[PDB]
Amino acid sequence: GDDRELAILATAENLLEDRPLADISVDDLAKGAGISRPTFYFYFPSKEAVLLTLLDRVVNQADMALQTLAENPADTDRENMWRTGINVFFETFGSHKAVTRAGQAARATSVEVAELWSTFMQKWIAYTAAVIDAERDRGAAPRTLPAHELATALNLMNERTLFASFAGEQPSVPEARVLDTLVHIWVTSIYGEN
Amino acid sequence: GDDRELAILATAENLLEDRPLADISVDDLAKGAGISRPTFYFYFPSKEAVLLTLLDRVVNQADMALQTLAENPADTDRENMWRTGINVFFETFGSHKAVTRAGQAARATSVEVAELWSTFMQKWIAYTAAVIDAERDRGAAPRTLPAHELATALNLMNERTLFASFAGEQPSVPEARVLDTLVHIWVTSIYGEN
Numbered sequence: 230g231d232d233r234e235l236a237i238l239a240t241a242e243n244l245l246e247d248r249p250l251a252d253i254s255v256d257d258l259a260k261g262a263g264i265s266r267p268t269f270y271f272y273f274p275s276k277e278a279v280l281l282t283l284l285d286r287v288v289n290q291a292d293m294a295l296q297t298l299a300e301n302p303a304d305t306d307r308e309n310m311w312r313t314g315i316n317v318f319f320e321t322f323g324s325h326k327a328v329t330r331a332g333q334a335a336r337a338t339s340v341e342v343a344e345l346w347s348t349f350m351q352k353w354i355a356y357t358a359a360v361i362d363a364e365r366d367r368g369a370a371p372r373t374l375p376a377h378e379l380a381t382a383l384n385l386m387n388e389r390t391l392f393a394s395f396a397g398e399q400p401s402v403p404e405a406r407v408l409d410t411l412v413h414i415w416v417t418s419i420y421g422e423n
Numbered sequence: 424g425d426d427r428e429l430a431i432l433a434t435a436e437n438l439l440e441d442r443p444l445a446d447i448s449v450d451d452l453a454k455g456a457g458i459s460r461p462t463f464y465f466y467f468p469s470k471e472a473v474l475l476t477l478l479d480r481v482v483n484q485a486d487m488a489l490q491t492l493a494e495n496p497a498d499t500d501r502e503n504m505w506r507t508g509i510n511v512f513f514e515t516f517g518s519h520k521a522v523t524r525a526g527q528a529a530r531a532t533s534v535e536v537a538e539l540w541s542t543f544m545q546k547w548i549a550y551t552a553a554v555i556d557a558e559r560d561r562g563a564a565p566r567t568l569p570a571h572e573l574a575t576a577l578n579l580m581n582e583r584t585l586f587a588s589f590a591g592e593q594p595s596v597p598e599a600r601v602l603d604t605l606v607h608i609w610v611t612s613i614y615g616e617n
């Protein structure tokens with residue numbers, strides 16, 4: 230039943246590892262899932278819809294992992310607290326590089342993909358700001374920039390910097406250095422008086 | 424003579440204000456520059472080449488403005504020093520929003536545009552790191568992250584955050600708040616012991 234849909238998804242993720250969505254065909258996806266072309270069209274209207282579904286899965290996985298941290302606080306210093314959160318996104322997206330690449334590209338051409346990315350970014354920024362606010366409220370973080378504005382910039386930084394690193398863009402921070410790089414910038418900017 | 428090339432450029436920049444490159448035609452550009460379609464093809468092989476030229480102009484303008492600061496140090500505190508540099512990019516790209524938008528999009532489809540952006544980013548990151556290094560050398564900045572890695576993340580942050588703001592993306596920092604936002608993050612991360 231659904232194992233056909235899952236097979237399509239798995240085929241798409243696999244094929245995106247070695248070439249872009251544009252060089253992958255509905256036939257390739259059907260062939261890989263062991264189904265005919267019209268059978269494919271029963272499960273998805275377009276290969277673009279397959280990518281959207283893949284991206285939605287990756288985004289919700291990151292989001293659910295963050296929810297679990299949010300409910301299950303690690304007993305440890307503030308630097309470690311931020312590192313563990315940023316790590317959700319490093320591990321989640323980092324474990325799904327092809328979907329991440331492809332989904333980034335699709336923001337330009339798909340309003341669904343753009344809106345999906347926008348929705349979750351608002352969620353993550355809002356949660357970031359709520360934590361900064363918690364920290365300010367307990368006297369651990371100084372009342373410097375508007376928390377929501379600082380949160381936005383830090384989240385956008387992580388988006389661009391993680392994705393450049395995963396892709397090995399020139400320039401990019403080495404993948405093995407990017408977590409520490411981001412954590413330093415978050416901690417200094419959140420706790421820094423100057 | 425060249426005023427025909429300049430006219431083409433000016434027409435392209437104008438038309439990009441209200442629609443994307445894809446919805447602008449060689450005819451539109453020729454019409455706007457007051458020349459025929461084949462005359463256009465004497466000055467540029469493609470409308471894509473026109474955009475590349477426009478982007479190259481904007482990028483070199485930012486770069487030359489930074490060179491001038493680099494040679495002409497403002498007498499003022501370290502926070503102001505970083506603010507004045509970041510401002511080169513806020514004013515330059517901010518004064519050319521359409522070219523900035525369009526050129527960002529063209530990185531996906533043009534290896535020339537991608538390589539142009541890559542080249543200048545390496546330059547700006549290298550200059551950032553050289554300044555951080557200067558600051559460390561004089562005992563003003565602590566020896567924390569590798570300077571080149573910190574520089575990369577801060578430059579990528581500015582790329583993504585400025586461009587989201589100029590475009591009014593959801594989410595984005597308000598354009599009237601983005602300079603202060605970026606300067607805070609640069610200063611705290613560069614000078615912060617913790």
Ligand SMILES: Fc1ccc(-c2nnc(-c3ccccc3)[nH]2)cc1
Pocket residue numbers: 311314315316318350353354356357360384385387388391
């Ligand atoms: F409480 C937290 C901690 C980290 C983060 C975070 N770390 N990285 C990101 C991010 C957001 C979008 C794309 C990639 C990474 N977001 C959000 C909330």
Ligand SMILES: Fc1ccc(-c2nnc(-c3ccccc3)[nH]2)cc1
Pocket residue numbers: 505508509510512544547548550551554578579581582585
């Ligand atoms: F010494 C400095 C100071 C600021 C900067 C800088 N500020 N903003 C950027 C940037 C880089 C790429 C795209 C947009 C902004 N770069 C570079 C070197």
